[PDB]
Tab-separated table of C-alpha atoms in Angstrom:
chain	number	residue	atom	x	y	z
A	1	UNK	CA	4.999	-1.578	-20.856
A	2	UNK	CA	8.706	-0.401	-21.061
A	3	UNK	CA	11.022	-3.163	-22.158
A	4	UNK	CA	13.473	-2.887	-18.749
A	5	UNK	CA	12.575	-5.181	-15.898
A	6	UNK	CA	12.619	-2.334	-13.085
A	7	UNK	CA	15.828	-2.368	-10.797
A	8	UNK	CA	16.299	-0.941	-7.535
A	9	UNK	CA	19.688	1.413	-7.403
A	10	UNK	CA	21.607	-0.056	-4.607
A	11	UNK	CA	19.444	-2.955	-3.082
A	12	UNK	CA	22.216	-4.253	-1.019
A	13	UNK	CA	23.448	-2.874	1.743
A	14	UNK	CA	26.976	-2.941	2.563
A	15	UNK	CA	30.123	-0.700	3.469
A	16	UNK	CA	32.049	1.032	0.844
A	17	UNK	CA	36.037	1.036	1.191
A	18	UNK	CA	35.772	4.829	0.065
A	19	UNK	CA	33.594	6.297	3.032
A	20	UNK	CA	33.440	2.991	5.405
A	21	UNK	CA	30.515	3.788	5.779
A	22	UNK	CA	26.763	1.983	4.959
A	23	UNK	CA	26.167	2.583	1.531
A	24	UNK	CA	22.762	4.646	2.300
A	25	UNK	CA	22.259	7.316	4.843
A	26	UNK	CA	19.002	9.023	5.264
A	27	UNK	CA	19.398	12.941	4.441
A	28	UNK	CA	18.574	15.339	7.417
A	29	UNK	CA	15.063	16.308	7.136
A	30	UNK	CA	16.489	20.098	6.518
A	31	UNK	CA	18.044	18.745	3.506
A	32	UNK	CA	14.388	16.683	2.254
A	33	UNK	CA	12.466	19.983	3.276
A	34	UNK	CA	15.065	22.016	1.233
A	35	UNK	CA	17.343	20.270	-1.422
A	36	UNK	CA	20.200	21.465	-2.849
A	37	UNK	CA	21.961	25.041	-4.310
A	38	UNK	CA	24.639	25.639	-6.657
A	39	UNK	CA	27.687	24.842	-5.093
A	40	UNK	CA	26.618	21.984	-3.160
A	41	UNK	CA	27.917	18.906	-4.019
A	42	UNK	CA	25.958	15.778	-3.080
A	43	UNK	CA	27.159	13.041	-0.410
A	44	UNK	CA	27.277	9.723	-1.864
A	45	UNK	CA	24.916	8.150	0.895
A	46	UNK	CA	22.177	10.531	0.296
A	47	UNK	CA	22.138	9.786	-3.682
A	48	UNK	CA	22.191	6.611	-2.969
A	49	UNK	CA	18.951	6.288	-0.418
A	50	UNK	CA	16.904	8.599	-2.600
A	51	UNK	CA	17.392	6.408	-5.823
A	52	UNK	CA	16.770	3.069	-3.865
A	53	UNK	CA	13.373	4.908	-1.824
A	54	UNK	CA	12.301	5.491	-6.038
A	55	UNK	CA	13.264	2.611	-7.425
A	56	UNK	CA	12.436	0.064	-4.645
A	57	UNK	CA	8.298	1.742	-3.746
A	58	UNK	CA	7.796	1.699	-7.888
A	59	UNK	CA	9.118	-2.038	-7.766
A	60	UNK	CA	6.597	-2.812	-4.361
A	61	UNK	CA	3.917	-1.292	-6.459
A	62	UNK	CA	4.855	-3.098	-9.988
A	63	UNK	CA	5.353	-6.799	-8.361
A	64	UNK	CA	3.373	-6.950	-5.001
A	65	UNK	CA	0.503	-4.531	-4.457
A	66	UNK	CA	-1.078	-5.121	-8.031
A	67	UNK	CA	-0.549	-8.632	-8.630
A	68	UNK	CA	-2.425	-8.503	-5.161
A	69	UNK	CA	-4.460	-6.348	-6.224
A	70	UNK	CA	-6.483	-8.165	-9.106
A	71	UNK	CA	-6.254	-11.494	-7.667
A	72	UNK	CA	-8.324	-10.317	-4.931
A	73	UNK	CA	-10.742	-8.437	-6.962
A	74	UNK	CA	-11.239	-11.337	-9.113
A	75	UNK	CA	-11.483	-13.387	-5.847
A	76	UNK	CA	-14.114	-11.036	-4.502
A	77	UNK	CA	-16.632	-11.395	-7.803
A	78	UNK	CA	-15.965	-15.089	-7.729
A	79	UNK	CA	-17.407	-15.407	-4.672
A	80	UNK	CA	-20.294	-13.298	-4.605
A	81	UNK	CA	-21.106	-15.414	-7.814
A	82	UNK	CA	-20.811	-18.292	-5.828
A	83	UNK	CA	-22.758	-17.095	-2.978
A	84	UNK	CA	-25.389	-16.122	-5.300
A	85	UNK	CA	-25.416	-19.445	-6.955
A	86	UNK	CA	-26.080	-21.196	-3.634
A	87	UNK	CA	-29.066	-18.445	-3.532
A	88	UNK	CA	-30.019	-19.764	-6.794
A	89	UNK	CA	-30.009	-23.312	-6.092
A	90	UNK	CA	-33.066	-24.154	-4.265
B	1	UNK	CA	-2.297	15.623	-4.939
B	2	UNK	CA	0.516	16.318	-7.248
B	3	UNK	CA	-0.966	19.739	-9.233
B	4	UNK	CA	1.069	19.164	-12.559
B	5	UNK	CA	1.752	16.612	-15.773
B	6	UNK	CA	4.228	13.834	-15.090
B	7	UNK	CA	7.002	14.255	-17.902
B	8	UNK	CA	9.518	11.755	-18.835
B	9	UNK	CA	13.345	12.408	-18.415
B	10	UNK	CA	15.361	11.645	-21.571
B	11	UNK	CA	12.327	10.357	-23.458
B	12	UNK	CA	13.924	10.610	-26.945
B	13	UNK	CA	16.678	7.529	-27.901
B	14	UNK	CA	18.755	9.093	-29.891
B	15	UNK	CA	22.729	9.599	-30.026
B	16	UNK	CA	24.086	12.346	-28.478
B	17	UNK	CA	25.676	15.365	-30.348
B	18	UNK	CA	28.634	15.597	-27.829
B	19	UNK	CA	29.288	11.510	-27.621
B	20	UNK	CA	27.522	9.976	-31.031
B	21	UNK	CA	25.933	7.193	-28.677
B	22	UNK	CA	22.258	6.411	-27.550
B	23	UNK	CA	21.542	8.796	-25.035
B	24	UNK	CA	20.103	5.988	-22.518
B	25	UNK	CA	22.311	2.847	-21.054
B	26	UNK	CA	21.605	0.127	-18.540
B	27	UNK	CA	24.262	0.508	-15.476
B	28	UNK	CA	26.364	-2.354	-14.437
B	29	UNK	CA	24.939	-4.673	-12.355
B	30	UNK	CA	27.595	-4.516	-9.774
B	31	UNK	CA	27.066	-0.795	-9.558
B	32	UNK	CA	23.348	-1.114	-9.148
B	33	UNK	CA	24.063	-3.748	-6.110
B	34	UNK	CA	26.082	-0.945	-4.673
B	35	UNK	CA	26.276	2.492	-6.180
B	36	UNK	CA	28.839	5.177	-6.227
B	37	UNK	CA	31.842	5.845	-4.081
B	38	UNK	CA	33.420	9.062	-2.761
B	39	UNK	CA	36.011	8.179	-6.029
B	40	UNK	CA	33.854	7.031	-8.541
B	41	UNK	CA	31.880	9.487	-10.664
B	42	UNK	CA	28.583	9.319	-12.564
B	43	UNK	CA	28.777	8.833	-15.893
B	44	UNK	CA	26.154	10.858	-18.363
B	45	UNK	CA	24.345	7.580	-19.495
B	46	UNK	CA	23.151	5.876	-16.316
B	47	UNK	CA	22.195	9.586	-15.052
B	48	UNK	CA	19.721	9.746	-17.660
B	49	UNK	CA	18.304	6.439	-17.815
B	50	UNK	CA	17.845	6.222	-13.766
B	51	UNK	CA	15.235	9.295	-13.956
B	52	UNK	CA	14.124	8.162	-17.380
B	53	UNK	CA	12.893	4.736	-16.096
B	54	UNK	CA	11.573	6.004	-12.916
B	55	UNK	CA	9.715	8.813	-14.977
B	56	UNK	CA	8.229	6.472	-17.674
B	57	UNK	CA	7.275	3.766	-14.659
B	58	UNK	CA	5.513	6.655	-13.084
B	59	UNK	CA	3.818	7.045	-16.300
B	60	UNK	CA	2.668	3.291	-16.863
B	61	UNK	CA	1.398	3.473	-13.269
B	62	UNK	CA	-0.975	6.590	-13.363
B	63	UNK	CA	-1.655	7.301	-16.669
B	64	UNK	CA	-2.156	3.562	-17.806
B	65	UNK	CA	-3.037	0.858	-15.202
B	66	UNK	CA	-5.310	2.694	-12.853
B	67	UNK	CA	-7.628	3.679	-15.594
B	68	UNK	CA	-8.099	0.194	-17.210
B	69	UNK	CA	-8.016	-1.510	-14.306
B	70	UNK	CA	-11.021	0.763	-13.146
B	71	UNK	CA	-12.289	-0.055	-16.409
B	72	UNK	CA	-12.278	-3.966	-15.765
B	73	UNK	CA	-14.089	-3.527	-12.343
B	74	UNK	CA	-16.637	-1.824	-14.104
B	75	UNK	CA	-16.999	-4.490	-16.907
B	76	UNK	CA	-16.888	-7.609	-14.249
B	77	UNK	CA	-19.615	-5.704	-12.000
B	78	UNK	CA	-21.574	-5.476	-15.281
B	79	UNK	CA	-20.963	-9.430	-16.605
B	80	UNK	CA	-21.797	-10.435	-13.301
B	81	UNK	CA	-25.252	-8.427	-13.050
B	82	UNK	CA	-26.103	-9.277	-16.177
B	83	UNK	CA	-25.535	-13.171	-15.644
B	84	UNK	CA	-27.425	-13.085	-12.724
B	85	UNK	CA	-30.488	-11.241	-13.836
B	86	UNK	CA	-30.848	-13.731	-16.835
B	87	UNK	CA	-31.359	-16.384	-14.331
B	88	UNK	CA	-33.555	-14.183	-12.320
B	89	UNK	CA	-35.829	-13.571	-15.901
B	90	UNK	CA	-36.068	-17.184	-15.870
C	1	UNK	CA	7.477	-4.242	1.504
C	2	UNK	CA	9.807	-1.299	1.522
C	3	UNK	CA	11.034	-0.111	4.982
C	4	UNK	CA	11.070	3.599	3.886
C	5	UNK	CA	8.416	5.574	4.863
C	6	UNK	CA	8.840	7.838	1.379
C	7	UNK	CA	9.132	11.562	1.936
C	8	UNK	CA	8.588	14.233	-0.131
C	9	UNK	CA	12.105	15.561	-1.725
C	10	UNK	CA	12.477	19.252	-1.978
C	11	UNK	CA	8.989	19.708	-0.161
C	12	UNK	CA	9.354	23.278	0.771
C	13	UNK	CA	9.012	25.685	-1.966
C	14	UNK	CA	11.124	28.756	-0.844
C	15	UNK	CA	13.767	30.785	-2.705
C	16	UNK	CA	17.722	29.565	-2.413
C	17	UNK	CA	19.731	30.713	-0.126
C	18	UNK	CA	22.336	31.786	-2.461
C	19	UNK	CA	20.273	32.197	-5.494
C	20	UNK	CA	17.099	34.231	-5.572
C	21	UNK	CA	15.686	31.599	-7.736
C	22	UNK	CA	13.282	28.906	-6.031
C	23	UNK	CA	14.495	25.935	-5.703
C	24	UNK	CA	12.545	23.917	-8.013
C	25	UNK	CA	12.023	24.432	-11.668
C	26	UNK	CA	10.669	22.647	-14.346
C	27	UNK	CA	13.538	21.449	-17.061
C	28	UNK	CA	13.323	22.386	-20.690
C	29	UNK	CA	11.406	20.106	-22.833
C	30	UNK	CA	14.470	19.977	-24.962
C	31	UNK	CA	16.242	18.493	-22.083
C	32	UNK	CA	13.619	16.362	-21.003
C	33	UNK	CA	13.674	14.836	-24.486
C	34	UNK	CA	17.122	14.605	-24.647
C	35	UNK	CA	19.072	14.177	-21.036
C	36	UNK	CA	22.063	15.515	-19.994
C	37	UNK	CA	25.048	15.226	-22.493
C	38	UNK	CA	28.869	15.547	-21.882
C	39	UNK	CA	29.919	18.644	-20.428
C	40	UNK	CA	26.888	20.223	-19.315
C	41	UNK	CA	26.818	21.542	-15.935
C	42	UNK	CA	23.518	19.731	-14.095
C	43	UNK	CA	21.915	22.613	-12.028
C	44	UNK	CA	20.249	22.071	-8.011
C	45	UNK	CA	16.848	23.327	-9.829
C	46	UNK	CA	16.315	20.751	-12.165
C	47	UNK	CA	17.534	17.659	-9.763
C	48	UNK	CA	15.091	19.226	-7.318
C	49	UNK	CA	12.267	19.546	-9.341
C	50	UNK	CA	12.669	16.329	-10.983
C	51	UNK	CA	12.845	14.252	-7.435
C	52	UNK	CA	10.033	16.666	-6.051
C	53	UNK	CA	7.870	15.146	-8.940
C	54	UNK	CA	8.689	11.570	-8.226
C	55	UNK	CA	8.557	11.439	-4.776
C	56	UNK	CA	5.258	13.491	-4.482
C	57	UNK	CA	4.014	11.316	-7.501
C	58	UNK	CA	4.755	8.072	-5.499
C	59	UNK	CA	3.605	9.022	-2.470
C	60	UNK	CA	-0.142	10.080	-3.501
C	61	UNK	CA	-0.463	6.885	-5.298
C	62	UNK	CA	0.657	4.916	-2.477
C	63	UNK	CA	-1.355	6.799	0.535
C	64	UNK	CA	-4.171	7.638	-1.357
C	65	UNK	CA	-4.826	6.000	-4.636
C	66	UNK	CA	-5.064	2.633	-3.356
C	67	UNK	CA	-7.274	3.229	-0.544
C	68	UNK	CA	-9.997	4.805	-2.496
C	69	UNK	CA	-10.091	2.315	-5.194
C	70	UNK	CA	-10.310	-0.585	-2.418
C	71	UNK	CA	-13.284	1.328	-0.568
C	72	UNK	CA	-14.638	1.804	-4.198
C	73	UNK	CA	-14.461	-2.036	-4.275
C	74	UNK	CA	-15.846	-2.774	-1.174
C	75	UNK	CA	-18.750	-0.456	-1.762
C	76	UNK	CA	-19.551	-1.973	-5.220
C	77	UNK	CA	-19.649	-5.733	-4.147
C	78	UNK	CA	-21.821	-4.669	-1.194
C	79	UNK	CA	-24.399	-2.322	-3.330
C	80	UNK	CA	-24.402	-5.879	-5.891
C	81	UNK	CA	-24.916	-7.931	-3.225
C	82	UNK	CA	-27.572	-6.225	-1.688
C	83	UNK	CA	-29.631	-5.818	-4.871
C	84	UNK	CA	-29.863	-9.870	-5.746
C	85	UNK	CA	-30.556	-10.456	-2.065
C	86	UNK	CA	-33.277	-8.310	-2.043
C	87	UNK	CA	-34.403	-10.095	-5.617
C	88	UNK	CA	-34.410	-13.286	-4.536
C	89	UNK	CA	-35.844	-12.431	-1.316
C	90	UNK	CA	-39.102	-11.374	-3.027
């Protein structure tokens, strides 16, 4: 329904002339279980993989699992129709 | 399962007291394919409109296409019974 | 498919460190309607909160959503197919 195709923050992967570094890290597992406090200020890499993990899993589920999704239950009642039409026949 | 109501960030398009512009814009591409630097800086805009598309997506997934596609199972079930059992009658 | 096997940001709901305020709160709906304008000062509560809801919100939809509607499938085109078999087989 909204009127933006979805896009996934930094789908390529690459090195950045600031850090040198990839452009997504994955935060610590302290930092997932936790987050952050006031004067914390947040590491490039770590922005950068959150917004892609939110952006790319709503994109999977958008463009691949639904799409999937109907043609197979549509698949599914088209051929227990058919099945039952061979029942049918004789 | 998630215990409260899924709100939308930025929901509103409106123009900003403090800048006189629509409160929502569409990043450039090139920082999408990338993402910030240790140098660059977020800009108010693209802050917003990352959560608010990820928010409202949320919302078309739950709140929207779950229910009717449940909906449509139900219905093709119910064609598909009922197309049978005329036969059957006959 | 995505690589990242999505985690939960901000999962632990404990105090700050430096602030006895949890961690996550739930913005303002005047904020939420809005977004954040020039010169306001973001604060660790409302980032956290806001990513807590997405990721959790993704998460359950993947892992457990999906599953039960396929089962719910399964179970409904085996229940129809077993009632016309038994039909036609008297």
């Amino acid at each position: 329904k909204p009127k933006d195709p979805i896009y996934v923050w930094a789908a390529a992967d690459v090195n950045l002339p600031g850090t040198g570094r990839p452009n997504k890290s994955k935060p610590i597992d302290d930092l997932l279980a936790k987050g952050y406090d006031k004067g914390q200020k947040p590491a490039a890499e770590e922005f950068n993989y959150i917004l892609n993990m939110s952006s790319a899993w709503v994109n999977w589920i958008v463009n691949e699992k639904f799409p999937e999704l109907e043609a197979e239950i549509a698949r599914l009642l088209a051929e227990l129709e058919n099945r039952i039409n061979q029942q049918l026949a004789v």
